[PDB]
Design a protein around this ligand. Structure first.
Ligand SMILES: *[C@@H]1O[C@H](CO)[C@@H](O)[C@H](O)[C@H]1NC(C)=O
Lengths: 44, 50
């Protein structure tokens, strides 16, 4: 019933790839929506 | 049939009714919790956020 989000930001200067490295993500927020999620879409 | 000349009983009353429900969703409202002052350098029982 809680929906949780995590995130991180970093600079990169590399093309068509995910750069090799290591990182960990801090918690950001959660929401008590309690709505089962089956699909999602991204907007640009 | 209200009129300004009225007695004890024949008066207009406002009524507000509250109601609540239970669900499997998380809770959203609750009453607040009291809290003691803090003593230091002593042997005591403690309760911090449960
Ligand atoms: C979660 O899925 C169940 C399927 O049994 C459905 O009844 C319920 O409505 C769904 N939750 C929400 C918030 O729609």
């Amino acid at each position: 019933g809680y929906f949780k989000i995590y995130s991180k930001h970093t600079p990169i200067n590399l093309v068509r790839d995910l750069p090799q490295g290591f990182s960990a993500l801090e918690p950001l927020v959660d929401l008590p929506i309690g709505i089962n999620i089956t699909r999602f879409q991204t907007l640009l | 049939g209200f009129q300004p000349t009225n007695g004890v009983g024949y008066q207009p009353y406002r009524v507000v009714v509250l109601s609540f429900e239970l669900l499997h969703a998380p809770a959203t409202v609750c009453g607040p919790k009291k809290s003691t002052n803090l003593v230091k350098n002593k042997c005591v029982n403690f309760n911090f956020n449960g």
